[PDB]
Amino acid sequence: MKIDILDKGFVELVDVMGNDLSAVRAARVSFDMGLERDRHLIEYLMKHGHETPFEHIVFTFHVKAPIFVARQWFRHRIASYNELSGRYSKLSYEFYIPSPERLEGYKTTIPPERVTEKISEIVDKAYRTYLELIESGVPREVARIVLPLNLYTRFFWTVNARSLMNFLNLRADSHAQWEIQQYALAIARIFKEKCPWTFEAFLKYAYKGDILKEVQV
Amino acid sequence: HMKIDILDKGFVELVDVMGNDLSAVRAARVSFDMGLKDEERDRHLIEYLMKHGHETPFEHIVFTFHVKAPIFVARQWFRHRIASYNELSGRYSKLSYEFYIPSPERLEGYKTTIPPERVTEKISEIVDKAYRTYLELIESGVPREVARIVLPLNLYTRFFWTVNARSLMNFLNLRADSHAQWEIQQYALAIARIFKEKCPWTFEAFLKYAYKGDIL
Amino acid sequence: MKIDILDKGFVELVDVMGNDLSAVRAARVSFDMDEERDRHLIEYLMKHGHETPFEHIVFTFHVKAPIFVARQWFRHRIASYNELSGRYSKLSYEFYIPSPERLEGYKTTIPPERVTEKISEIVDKAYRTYLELIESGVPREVARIVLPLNLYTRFFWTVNARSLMNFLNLRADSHAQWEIQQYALAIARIFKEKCPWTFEAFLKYAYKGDILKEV
Amino acid sequence: MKIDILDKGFVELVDVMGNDLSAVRAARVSFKDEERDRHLIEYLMKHGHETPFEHIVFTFHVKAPIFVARQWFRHRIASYNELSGRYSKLSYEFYIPSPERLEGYKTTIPPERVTEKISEIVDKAYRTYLELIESGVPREVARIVLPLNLYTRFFWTVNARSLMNFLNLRADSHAQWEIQQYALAIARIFKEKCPWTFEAFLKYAYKGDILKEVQV
Ligand SMILES: Cc1cc2nc3c(=O)[nH]c(=O)nc-3n(C[C@H](O)[C@H](O)[C@H](O)COP(=O)(O)OP(=O)(O)OC[C@H]3O[C@@H](n4cnc5c(N)ncnc54)[C@H](O)[C@@H]3O)c2cc1C
Ligand SMILES: Cc1cc2nc3c(=O)[nH]c(=O)nc-3n(C[C@H](O)[C@H](O)[C@H](O)COP(=O)(O)OP(=O)(O)OC[C@H]3O[C@@H](n4cnc5c(N)ncnc54)[C@H](O)[C@@H]3O)c2cc1C
Ligand SMILES: Cc1cc2nc3c(=O)[nH]c(=O)nc-3n(C[C@H](O)[C@H](O)[C@H](O)COP(=O)(O)OP(=O)(O)OC[C@H]3O[C@@H](n4cnc5c(N)ncnc54)[C@H](O)[C@@H]3O)c2cc1C
Ligand SMILES: Cc1cc2nc3c(=O)[nH]c(=O)nc-3n(C[C@H](O)[C@H](O)[C@H](O)COP(=O)(O)OP(=O)(O)OC[C@H]3O[C@@H](n4cnc5c(N)ncnc54)[C@H](O)[C@@H]3O)c2cc1C
Ligand SMILES: O=c1[nH]c(=O)n([C@H]2C[C@H](O)[C@@H](COP(=O)(O)O)O2)cc1Br
Ligand SMILES: O=c1[nH]c(=O)n([C@H]2C[C@H](O)[C@@H](COP(=O)(O)O)O2)cc1Br
Ligand SMILES: O=c1[nH]c(=O)n([C@H]2C[C@H](O)[C@@H](COP(=O)(O)O)O2)cc1Br
Ligand SMILES: O=c1[nH]c(=O)n([C@H]2C[C@H](O)[C@@H](COP(=O)(O)O)O2)cc1Br
């Protein structure tokens, strides 16, 4: 399962542990019980605020995204991350270039096409300078500081269902930057495919965001 | 699928697992824009990570356990915050007559006034009386959340535990150690055993370069 | 500042870092930024779900509570704890004995005041058996396993305003066991004194519980 | 307490709760005696009993380059609040490495040229950013052309235990030089507020390699 986001990014599901029944399973222990009834428990827990059972469902994603996007994403402390290093590796020529449609809805002095053009020009000069510094023997950890925030980076993300839901509440929302919204939708799609009952219950009883109720999957 | 019996009626049962040794290898490699490789190389990285103290990669390995243990053991266990728990409720369900009765050998080394067997006998008695009082209150209409307050700390409880490899190793350092209570140690050995079965490379590397305990 | 809870328990403030303005300062370092403007920002943050700024206010409490209460309290992982050790020190003769009014509203085959008695009896026999074992040479970590769940323990609790609010949402609520609700009420009271603005705003826009809305 | 770091950065102590005695009070669970108290701090540090130090909390105000902040924010056991590029107009403040930063590395161009190369690109980037903002492009979009050396500010609230982990990892030669400088500043303040804990830390638990070589 891999989903393309923006111009060069993506969200890919690396691994998953458990399913909706994992949460049903965990929840049952409270009443010395085990695993149509199970589906009803998910709703109950969701609408009543029993979030802990969903912590036993865990996902590991492989994400390709712009650093300005990663910086916001990494603010979610209840999860695990492992990212590409700008200190250790030679960064490749890959940057997020917004399409003219990105400025749809805003009045600008210069054409959307020009805006897209200027971002590219800057990206191009920045990367050349970066390579020139490295070729000259400048340490990678120093040379990379001239690279812009729209530079693509990669990382693994292991997070459980409760934290992922908090993530969707905050990122699969209109107040979050459009770019991370797009990633959140892909995360939602995958979440829905692996835990359909929890997902449906989540949208109907606890989701606090606004876009997942208008945009399918 | 794994089950280890602990104490007289307890147990540690592996319910699920996500990833294996290579899950940490994958996570780690990404820092160099690389992926997996041969076994010799990948296994070398794991020990490398363990040696230098790079533990984040091991967080991508997650375990889900089903544990049955006495409350005094569980209390110490739930002190490990970097994990998830779901436990049997004394407020909601009627508790079963199951308590941890120490065997006479638990007193080995300690010279006692009364024979060990007697200590065992006395523990069972108090437990029996407490439980009868509990059943008595429950059957007379007393709310369960109130009636259970007479139950002793050796009452058995059950819970689910989802924890990743890194937090798990911290658990073993602290609980797979002679400084921890013998009872919790036994559970830690069972946890280590399962960790060994599922992530051989990580475990071995752990024991050789990071494990700070003494019983493993 | 100390508040007694139940028959022998309590909640006392040990220390606190910051106040309503601590949250105001944390948040202002976002837009690169007086009373009305500040208290309004606080109500604004609370109303929209911007909770991180409240993490910069921290409290440390000293709590004396029954273990069954502590087992529920310790489930709140986003915080720090340090409790008395039952295997290191001899436990004192202090247990939570519910008052007859605790069974109020319930129809029981045994008079409430009789239930109170049965609980005391167990406590007494369990504790004596415990001292009997210890004096007999049984190590404390083993002898104490016969003690009941209403045995009082003590601990230090350091938590920030955000986690504290999650705690009040879940514990200062009728779905929580009454005994812990009482402690949560005490926690809320101290929190109100130190952060009136944050507290006021919490009740009005984020508080999900029910009893703080009536007590 | 405010310490200048790099060319435009700084570490400022905003607030602090408790001191060395706070860890002591927590460990004993009560509420003095330097001999015993300090001895206890060292005992706790020597045997790995770290939870008591979580009762000591700091709030810092930091100004640092995004590439430094990104590494810093990887420390999850803490609280943060940073300036927003989506909401605020960014100031013309970037970290420009001085020639000395390249002492020891053999380059095909004079270290001063590297400084100029970096300064020029930073200048171009900021100028395009300003033109984008002026023409009407949304802040959150216009700032994506800004370099990783753009300075940002944030509030950091962390307890002594997590801060000690931070020092282990950052006040070390393996961490990038730029964040090492901040860690030193963090260490000075910590040392100033909790002299007993810091000394005990350096003596028994610290895993880094610079704090035992550089005063305060
Ligand atoms: C021999 C022994 C004796 C003990 N005696 C006592 C006692 O007398 N009183 C008592 O109350 N407890 C006692 N404990 C419990 C101990 O204090 C810890 O609570 C327990 O070991 C859980 O460990 P942890 O904090 O390392 O783990 P977790 O809570 O699971 O945390 C794992 C890691 O994340 C961290 N971490 C998590 N949360 C925070 C935070 N809020 N701030 C900073 N870092 C954080 C640390 O790096 C930690 O090692 C004892 C434990 C042992 C093994
Ligand atoms: C009325 C009531 C009934 C209950 N019944 C039961 C029961 O039958 N069985 C049982 O085991 N427990 C039960 N609990 C305990 C409950 O499951 C929680 O453990 C407890 O409320 C502590 O809450 P918390 O997880 O929200 O808080 P904290 O552990 O303090 O966490 C605060 C916040 O950080 C989060 N968080 C922390 N750690 C993680 C993580 N690892 N993954 C994802 N998010 C995380 C969430 O956003 C959370 O709200 C009950 C509680 C109440 C109030
Ligand atoms: C020299 C150096 C090189 C690095 N290289 C890379 C790299 O190539 N790629 C990369 O992505 N990162 C890299 N990092 C970042 C590193 O992986 C950690 O994210 C960073 O050091 C923050 O540390 P921490 O996990 O110990 O701290 P915190 O996140 O603050 O956590 C403190 C303690 O609580 C714990 N803890 C917190 N959360 C969890 C959890 N979810 N599960 C288990 N335990 C938990 C542990 O006991 C931990 O030590 C590097 C750091 C250094 C110092
Ligand atoms: C529209 C929008 C605007 C934003 N603007 C800003 C800004 O201007 N400046 C800025 O710095 N950030 C900003 N953020 C980031 C925000 O402050 C959070 O850090 C981010 O959403 C991650 O969320 P979290 O804290 O809920 O999640 P996580 O860090 O993953 O935590 C999940 C849950 O555990 C909890 N938790 C975890 N750690 C702690 C802790 N240490 N103390 C108490 N509770 C804890 C809470 O219950 C939390 O919801 C913004 C986010 C959004 C969506
Ligand atoms: O929508 C947002 N999402 C987010 O995660 N932040 C966090 C990210 C970063 O640590 C700092 C400033 O981010 P921006 O430049 O993207 O606004 O606060 C801020 C905003 Br607004
Ligand atoms: O070895 C120990 N392990 C542990 O987790 N505690 C925590 C458990 C409980 O929250 C409180 C008191 O525990 P004991 O009564 O078991 O000592 O401190 C204490 C000790 Br000593
Ligand atoms: O209201 C509750 N609060 C709580 O914290 N638990 C946690 C406490 C303990 O770890 C386990 C069982 O608790 P009780 O016996 O008190 O129900 O689940 C359960 C319930 Br119901
Ligand atoms: O020393 C380091 N410190 C750090 O915090 N990272 C984390 C920061 C970021 O999330 C990602 C890539 O960082 P660099 O570009 O700085 O290498 O891994 C990496 C290295 Br190496």
XYZ file of C-alpha atoms in Angstrom, chain C residues 12 14-18 22 25-33 52-56 58-60 62 79-84 88 154-158 160, chain D residues 14-18 22 25-31 49 51-52 54-55 57-59 61 78-84 87-88 91 153-157 159:
76
model
C -1.077 18.846 49.596
C 4.366 20.794 47.412
C 5.431 23.227 44.704
C 4.317 24.819 41.437
C 6.081 26.304 38.444
C 4.479 29.267 36.751
C 3.320 30.901 31.993
C 4.141 33.432 27.483
C 4.616 30.013 25.900
C 1.890 30.686 23.324
C 3.009 34.231 22.442
C 6.294 32.780 21.225
C 4.422 31.829 18.035
C 3.383 35.201 16.604
C 6.710 36.597 17.806
C 4.644 38.662 20.276
C 0.338 22.593 24.497
C 0.856 26.056 26.049
C -0.614 24.720 29.300
C 2.138 22.126 29.563
C 4.464 24.896 30.839
C 3.673 22.267 36.488
C 2.628 21.057 39.946
C 4.004 18.622 42.481
C 2.097 14.973 48.014
C 3.370 12.491 34.843
C 5.992 11.532 37.435
C 5.607 9.385 40.543
C 7.568 8.309 43.608
C 5.758 6.163 46.152
C 6.515 4.624 49.531
C 11.575 -1.490 51.953
C 1.817 7.992 49.966
C 3.420 9.423 46.868
C 4.708 12.559 45.171
C 2.978 13.497 41.901
C 4.443 15.954 39.396
C 1.683 19.648 34.040
C 12.573 31.369 31.892
C 11.566 29.482 35.026
C 12.463 26.569 37.267
C 10.675 24.414 39.805
C 12.577 22.915 42.692
C 13.241 18.372 45.238
C 12.058 15.057 48.897
C 10.599 12.920 46.105
C 12.837 9.917 46.747
C 11.984 9.959 50.468
C 8.332 10.880 49.867
C 8.194 13.503 52.637
C 7.323 17.197 53.056
C 17.188 5.444 40.394
C 12.640 9.016 38.609
C 13.222 11.361 41.601
C 11.746 14.153 37.206
C 10.405 16.353 40.002
C 11.567 21.057 36.028
C 13.025 23.753 33.774
C 11.520 26.106 31.220
C 13.548 30.108 25.935
C 9.453 17.500 26.946
C 7.110 20.354 26.044
C 7.544 22.824 23.189
C 6.097 26.006 21.728
C 7.708 27.535 18.665
C 7.157 30.562 16.455
C 5.004 29.813 13.419
C 1.350 32.829 10.988
C 4.282 35.178 11.547
C 12.743 38.026 10.374
C 12.534 30.561 18.804
C 10.801 28.222 21.227
C 9.954 27.529 24.847
C 11.260 24.235 26.203
C 9.969 22.764 29.467
C 12.483 17.773 33.777
